[PDB]
Symmetry: none
Subunit: 226 residues, 2 copies
């Protein structure tokens, strides 16, 4: 299992940050439409203006992003990127039943949600300030590419290198999640502007959908923070 | 570090089961009244008809018990065991300050709560379907006895044998918790009919109480589920 750690230095810019770290052992898919349906209903919820804390939570993330030098309009947190696409098109496209499910959670609860193949990790995830020498494997023009984060940028990383740039802006390719992964790691990331009871409810939507999708699936969820 | 595991097959009879697993390293008891006050106030709360989800949760647990062959009228879950006694007898007898506090959590939040001496475990706890050959050290009319669970009975067990029969109906003698224990394991077991934010609230009542009773105590909390 994966035991994430957060550098105490992050309290300088994001005091009161809290996240659910959820380790999953998957099972064969038996209800493949779970993700599609949750996503369709999440898009309507957003179009209907839900949830109530969305603007305050997104604003709080944008303050955080600015605090480590990022331009949030150009490189938004994952929650805002999804919300803007739903409010521009009225819907969002399928990709994979598990990705659709966790994007649906992110939309319904206005909360950044990451999902990764935990078998691809070397060591445990850590949330730290980057020094600019780290490697990040990504896509430049649809093909594999490598780049480095900015000095002082907040990153998730393992022993090899960066696994998510600018806190929750862009996941790397190496640890990308697929519905056929035998071992998954999700991180649902929040600031005080989101009520902690709603974070618990987002995690409960996620694990319920995963279990309906894959009967026999098991999870371990831990509240972490700085 | 007790690392409980649960069998994938439990999803077939208790889809959406989730339990808060709390590992505790005790400290000296500086305020032994913590358990006694919590239990009195919890009995009062049950008399007033709290909490809202009690009926639905106990009903769902009875559904799960019948699904593996038990007679909940003869062998209720531990939460209804306590609730029935308070409603029938107006109060509940003190036993031990740590036992009193965790029974109070069960009463106030209408959730089965197990408390055990983790130093008495041989290996790690596991939640499995019994095959009927395991052994279980219990009491018959006050006097020590050995039983075996039914084939298909859901049990908590360790390397030696059963530590709780019929999921959360009756703990064994071997791993009974006492206030003087140096290492303690609590399991607060819930079904979807209990709102998950109230399960976290129950956990916080328990760890806030333990921290007041034993300043300097350490704990780690993990939500596990199927």
């Amino acid at each position: 299992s994966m035991l994430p750690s957060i550098s105490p230095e992050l309290a300088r810019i994001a005091p009161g940050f809290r996240a659910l770290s959820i380790n999953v052992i998957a099972a064969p898919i038996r209800d493949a439409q779970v993700g599609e349906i949750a996503l369709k209903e999440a898009c309507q919820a957003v179009i209907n203006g839900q949830p109530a804390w969305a603007q305050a939570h997104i604003d709080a993330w944008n303050t955080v992003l600015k605090a480590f030098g990022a331009k949030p309009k150009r490189t938004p947190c994952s929650a805002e990127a999804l919300r803007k696409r739903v409010l521009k098109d009225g819907t969002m496209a399928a990709l994979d039943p598990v990705v659709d499910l966790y994007n649906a959670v992110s939309l319904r609860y206005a909360v950044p949600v990451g999902g990764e193949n935990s078998a691809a990790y070397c060591g445990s995830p850590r949330l730290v300030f980057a020094d600019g020498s780290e490697t990040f494997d990504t896509l430049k023009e649809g093909q594999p590419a490598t780049e480095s984060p900015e000095p002082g940028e907040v990153i998730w990383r393992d022993d090899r290198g960066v696994t998510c740039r600018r806190w929750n802006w862009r996941q790397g390719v190496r640890t990308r999640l697929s519905a056929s992964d035998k071992a998954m790691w999700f991180i649902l990331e929040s600031l005080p502007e989101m009520p902690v009871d709603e974070l618990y409810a987002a995690g409960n939507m996620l694990t319920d959908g995963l279990e309906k999708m894959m009967p026999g699936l098991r999870f371990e969820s831990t509240l972490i923070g700085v």
